[PDB]
Design an enzyme around this catalytic site. Structure first.
Site, PDB file in Angstrom:
ATOM      1  N   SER A  52     -14.828  -3.892   6.705  1.00 48.99           N
ATOM      2  CA  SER A  52     -15.024  -2.915   7.168  1.00 48.99           C
ATOM      3  C   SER A  52     -16.654  -3.097   6.268  1.00 48.99           C
ATOM      4  CB  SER A  52     -14.529  -2.034   6.234  1.00 48.99           C
ATOM      5  OG  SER A  52     -13.476  -1.999   6.788  1.00 48.99           O
ATOM      6  N   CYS A 109      -9.202   5.169   5.575  1.00 52.62           N
ATOM      7  CA  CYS A 109      -9.333   4.352   4.306  1.00 52.62           C
ATOM      8  C   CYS A 109     -10.260   4.526   3.501  1.00 52.62           C
ATOM      9  CB  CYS A 109     -10.097   3.091   5.705  1.00 52.62           C
ATOM     10  SG  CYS A 109     -10.925   1.600   4.988  1.00 52.62           S
ATOM     11  N   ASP A 126       0.682  -1.222  -0.211  1.00 50.07           N
ATOM     12  CA  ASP A 126      -0.338  -0.040  -0.206  1.00 50.07           C
ATOM     13  C   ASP A 126       0.862   1.519  -0.230  1.00 50.07           C
ATOM     14  OD1 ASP A 126      -1.899   2.518   0.392  1.00 50.07           O
ATOM     15  OD2 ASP A 126      -3.160   0.933   2.086  1.00 50.07           O
ATOM     16  N   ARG A 181      -5.635   2.956  -7.055  1.00 54.26           N
ATOM     17  CA  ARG A 181      -7.161   2.619  -7.076  1.00 54.26           C
ATOM     18  C   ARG A 181      -7.722   4.086  -6.520  1.00 54.26           C
ATOM     19  NH1 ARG A 181      -7.766   1.734  -0.625  1.00 54.26           N
ATOM     20  NH2 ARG A 181      -8.925   3.612   0.285  1.00 54.26           N
ATOM     21  N   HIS A 208     -13.759   3.623   3.363  1.00 53.15           N
ATOM     22  CA  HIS A 208     -15.208   3.026   4.143  1.00 53.15           C
ATOM     23  C   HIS A 208     -15.024   3.740   5.276  1.00 53.15           C
ATOM     24  CE1 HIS A 208     -13.939  -1.011   1.797  1.00 53.15           C
ATOM     25  NE2 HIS A 208     -14.744  -0.179   1.539  1.00 53.15           N
ATOM     26  N   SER A 251     -13.507  -7.046   1.644  1.00 50.33           N
ATOM     27  CA  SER A 251     -12.984  -5.877   2.730  1.00 50.33           C
ATOM     28  C   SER A 251     -13.652  -6.113   4.315  1.00 50.33           C
ATOM     29  CB  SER A 251     -13.515  -3.599   2.472  1.00 50.33           C
ATOM     30  OG  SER A 251     -13.121  -3.403   3.973  1.00 50.33           O
ATOM     31  N   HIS A 285       0.197  -0.355  -4.666  1.00 42.10           N
ATOM     32  CA  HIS A 285      -0.976   0.608  -4.685  1.00 42.10           C
ATOM     33  C   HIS A 285      -1.118   2.220  -4.963  1.00 42.10           C
ATOM     34  CE1 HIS A 285      -3.416   0.351  -1.268  1.00 42.10           C
ATOM     35  NE2 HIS A 285      -2.879  -1.289  -1.437  1.00 42.10           N
TER      36      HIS A 285
END
Ligand code: MG
Ligand code: MG
Ligand code: MG
Ligand code: MG
Ligand code: MG
Ligand code: MG
Ligand code: MG
Lengths: 427, 427, 427, 427
Positions: C317, C191, C153, C228, C193, C315, C180
């Site tokens: 989440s 995040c 990440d 992303r 989410h 996810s 990414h």
């Protein structure tokens, strides 16, 4: 259970803000209850941050001015204080160039990991503490305060208000006395004497200074907070949303969406006044070393805030003798002090002192081998009447102090260091 | 399911040991198949360790000798190469004093975390790589090899053969060219010019050297391995187990259980001869800079091992003029080189250059503020005639290199750094 | 004079770009000449980065899909490969929560120091290398490739294009296989989410994807680059300068200067189409696990780039059984692979596996002490049928591997570890 | 010129030593003046180390016994406290295997850098503080004390008495409550249940224990000091210099020069009695989990020191059900508590929980993808009855707490995190 580190109540915090002269013209747009709400149920004591910030604040009022040089290693700070200086400056530029946690050499563009300056703050405090320990066992009282306050670079905060918060909190954990914060976009941060500078709106920097004060309050230490503006040379700003910045917007835009803005002393004076309620000291970056431009900025600010202390970067990014003569150079700091610049500092002094001296030695050594080094060693012996002590590198670095630990543990230890050394025998 | 990094066969490594002159009189008590058994299925390439070790081996044979100064920061190493030096020495003493991962100032007693010297090896290589990148875009061919080989301090291995192994492995991952290993007890390690030294048995130090070679073999790089003996001044040894040590054991014990042992050149000659099949260079610590003692050590070792290269510590722990006259000092390294001391180094050069130069600057600053700094800047302008480049500090740390990346990503970027700088304007 | 690490010529680079199918539909808006000019005179080989990128690429084309779980410790990744997974996912969320270099627990807002994910890449590779080494000496062939590719990440780059470039460079140096990069403002990063997200202009994210490819090219490795987009939920954007974003700009503005923008799948589709020439895979964050919305995005993107591979965040989440029945959950990843989602990952798998298992253990332990732990050990024993090996923790962590080093250095060593251990005698 | 952190006087230290019951049966062979002599002119307060040591000492007297699990990440300690545990065990083994500053996986042989365990102490404390901060703003009072005392592994000191001193000082600065120290040779250190262990002489471990108390005294905190003996299983000792160890020396020697020695309960009892004046708790490693052997050890030691508290390692290096029936297992810790084993800990609990939970999840995910993860997530939902909170991972890691910081700085910030999040919408 235990009551160690119990946090104060909101009322006690409030009384302090109301009555302690430290907070005379300090605006906090949050409340004391907000501070307590963030402190959990234990507040770690931050001894060196508290002591440093206190000492720095007294010094800023008792001395004609407080001056400093940039330090990027522990030994650098020890020599600065041994030589008589009363504060240490922690340059972020220098951390970028030669002392950051990526291991890489960087230009001054907030490229390095955000916890790099805190680590150097801790290092400098550790080095000063070691000199203090060594001076105690040696009975050396020539230095009154080994733990000189450290003023460190928070750059543009490495992001938003929460990155500012965490940087200040880390700086305090490392034992900083003061920190400075500049009104540039973090993602395009530059040395104030590079180009390509982009300002952020006036209110955004007020958020940054508010966040820096909040982190110090939550950490329960009276950290000195310095606001820096880069508006003298920056011709870009992220947005025109702030009405105080709109007078300088020109209408031109860049491909990135930045706004062109009219640079100079005028945006600087207005931003200094907007930052003043949120800043213990105010620093404006300048393009040249000019006592008259400094007087112009100073007078304007004290016209509205007469007690407002200022700070001045005596920058090695200026070619000094191309602009001033020897008489002006020699009075420069004293004159600035009269105008209210109570903190003055040579940001890159460590970089230049380190790089020049090693080039000088290495080039000699490349030609003359040992003759080059002995010249240095003889200069070192000579400097000992001035107070220099590092010619005896073993004691300078703690050999006698750790001997004392070892003999405290085992007085009959046959493996102590100073007895039988060539330092004891030849120095 | 890739061919990248596939290890060699045993036969392939064996053939290299048999045919490559690099391994002429190198004894390995383990087998090639032992090396393959430890490599897993992927062997990481270590470009800088390979190139550094190969360049170092050549210079040891092509040049009349190789000299170097201790470097504790990246900029220090850059200045040494800029000034013509062709190798860098990485002192563990200096790392203890001002550059280790604990953050503390320490005497030279293996107090710091064992990965500190690897981290500085990596830093120096990063710094030299930045200089190499800048020279390439500036079309600067004044330096032929920016990636000078680094010789780094392995101390006493920080424990047993496995701690030795891991330290060598980390030094190689960071790009070391050669490493040195001393026959002291790690838990009581000292600078060779401190007291309280404890030797380990001759065979235990052969174990250390074997482990350092194995770690280089498993890493598939020809790292230069340096064996150091501390027997000139040490009067303690851990054990009388080794028959080669017993002639010097007196039978007196200390309360910790150490054995008293007769120090001097005779034990150094015996240990040197024992280490020579396992060591690319051999280093005897001495208590004074003495060309006649150096000759006696050298002739004794070369009587048995005529091609054995030696290394010599031109130590700042000697009071140089108290022992030698300027005439001998001037010829010191040249004379040593004729006796086979092909790698010579001033261990604490960086410490003294950094501490002295900062004390000097700070002392003047305390009394004369800007006048003291302008003196340094003018010295830097002068030294440009000799090749110094750090007066332009922005380009020195890569502002132009990062501009080049920035305009490579976006040629129309409005936020590059050198255009509009005071450096472009005033230097 | 050395040929180790000599950089390629632009023509070789150009020819690989034109002829390697790896680069089939990859746009580079800079030249091969530009890349070479940034390489200095030595290019370090990055073995794990090269091997992992090649393996990852081939797996994306050879398998129905590649799936992964988030890993935040080295042991975690080992257990993932031992259990049969073929790639590691390195979650930045998890690094902020429990594995970053500040030492603090953070929400997923780019608060931690920017070299934190690189360090975990290097850690995971070290742990997989240890498992690889152990397997070799144990003759364990049950895992065909221990060095599974790591996808890591890079968040919003922690600043501008230069911060992106340095993060990608450090990820590669640590051995990453792919990275990414999301179109959020770094200083307000969330995040996907979490609420409060701020988009950057489409071109600025293209600049980021270009910067990441450039660092991979300068480091001479075929790193997998993933774009992303966070535009499904974000209702804020920094600027309306890009005409591709204007159709979604409402015109209202916040106090910070941000522009309100119409969120959802259509800005995601447009952004994905704009990123496609600069991304090996494309990832849109969504608010629910919904196959129909995934199909909509896939169909729309592939209608213009049919060969464009996609990634999907499975996810934690999401409240999974609140949105799907067990039948849909069981087919979810299979169904996604049929739509071109070739890299699928459970981001927070490590955080939840670690947190729940320790709560469950500690809760039972507070109640029945040793009985609760014995239940765990017995499940570990029972898992050996499925391939679990860590019940024998000593060998799991390399005691037998280091015994092999020890006996290589000294075959008669009396201090090896596994002989006489309780592991040898009780397991 | 400040009273912050002014050291206490020697008379003040003496009075506390003389009158505070914490020092009832504590021998210090150095003086209160020796302590002040090492303190410099400023003593930093160590809030978490002070509070932790005080709570730990209290709990060792209030509770029937204090039991802990090994924790190697911050989230691990948070879940241990959430589930009701009142102390955290920090295992050196676990740091070697999965959490040390080298980045490598190691067996338990003191191979990692010596500041690794302090870093994990600081991390655990940071993680507990964040849970404490979150609980406060959440109004969560379910946990009485989030800052559970931490007992950490000092291994064999990583060298001599000064390495011991520096590790204890670093552990204290990170906020540790207690530390344990074993009588092994540091260069040959092993897990107590590995072979190849080498004891050091009794007096040398008294020196280590004295060194560990000295550092706590100089740092002005009452750190709990635990003494560990490895003499149950070790068959080697470095020296026969100590008359207290000579009863067990057999006369035979190894090729390295180690002395063979007769192992068992008898040397452990003699060593525990020698250590008792210098240890707050005494720990003997055992080869099996055996209540009768434990009883014999406690009775023999308490025969001479009736108040001497003991510690016991409920080691996962035992195959528990291989030696004991479920009834003995269920009563094990209570039974030990009645014998005086007031600190009991499962050293490798974190390693096994982390490794087993990830293998289990990943093996399921390999076979059935999302079904396997949903099984975990549903177990997490179910665990909320028992007090588990981490299913809501956003607030668990501080998204709510940083939101409160953000709206303290700017109450109308449009970039807060939890509002609009899937966690708010779905959990
Ligand atoms: Mg700066
Ligand atoms: Mg003010
Ligand atoms: Mg050394
Ligand atoms: Mg040789
Ligand atoms: Mg992320
Ligand atoms: Mg594409
Ligand atoms: Mg241990």
């Amino acid at each position: 259970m235990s009551v160690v580190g119990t946090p104060k109540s909101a009322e006690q915090i409030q009384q302090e803000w109301d009555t302690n002269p430290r907070w005379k013209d300090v605006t906090r747009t949050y409340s004391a209850e907000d501070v307590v709400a963030l402190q959990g149920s234990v507040v770690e004591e931050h001894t060196l941050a508290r002591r440093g910030a206190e000492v720095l604040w007294e010094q800023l009022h008792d001395l004609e001015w407080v001056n400093a040089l940039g330090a990027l290693t522990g030994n650098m700070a020890v020599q600065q204080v041994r030589a008589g200086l009363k504060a240490i400056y922690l340059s972020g530029w220098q951390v970028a160039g030669d002392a950051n946690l990526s291991g890489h050499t960087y230009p001054d563009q907030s490229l390095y990991p955000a916890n790099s300056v805190p680590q150097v703050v801790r290092r400098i405090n550790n080095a000063l503490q070691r000199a203090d320990q060594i001076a105690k066992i040696e009975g050396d009282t020539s230095v009154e305060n080994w733990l000189a306050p450290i003023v460190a670079d928070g750059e543009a905060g490495f992001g938003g208000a929460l990155n500012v918060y965490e940087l200040q909190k880390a700086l305090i954990a490392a034992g900083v006395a003061g920190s400075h914060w500049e009104d540039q976009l973090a993602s395009e941060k530059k040395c104030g004497h590079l180009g390509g500078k982009v300002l952020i709106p006036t209110q955004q920097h007020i958020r940054t200074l508010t966040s820096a004060r909040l982190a110090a309050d939550v950490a329960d230490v009276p950290t000195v907070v310095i606001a820096r503006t880069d508006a003298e040379a920056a011709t870009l700003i992220t947005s025109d949303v702030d009405e105080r910045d709109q007078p300088f917007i020109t209408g031109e835009r860049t491909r990135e969406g930045f706004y062109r803005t009219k640079n100079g002393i005028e945006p600087c004076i207005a931003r200094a006044k907007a930052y003043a309620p949120f800043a213990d000291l105010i620093w404006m970056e300048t393009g040249t070393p000019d006592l008259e431009a400094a007087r112009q900025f100073s007078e304007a600010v004290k016209a509205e805030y007469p007690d407002q202390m200022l700070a001045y970067n005596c920058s090695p990014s200026f070619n000094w003798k191309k602009h001033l003569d020897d008489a002006t150079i020699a009075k420069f700091q004293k004159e600035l002090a009269a105008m209210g610049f109570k903190f003055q500092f040579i940001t890159l002094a460590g970089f230049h002192a380190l790089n020049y001296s090693m080039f000088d030695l290495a080039y000699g050594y490349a030609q003359n081998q040992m003759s080059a080094y002995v010249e240095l060693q003889e200069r070192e012996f000579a400097a000992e009447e001035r107070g220099y002590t590092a010619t005896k590198h073993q004691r300078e670095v703690g050999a006698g102090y750790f001997d004392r630990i070892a003999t405290t543990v085992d007085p009959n230890s046959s493996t102590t260091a100073l007895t039988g050394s060539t330092e004891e025998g030849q120095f």
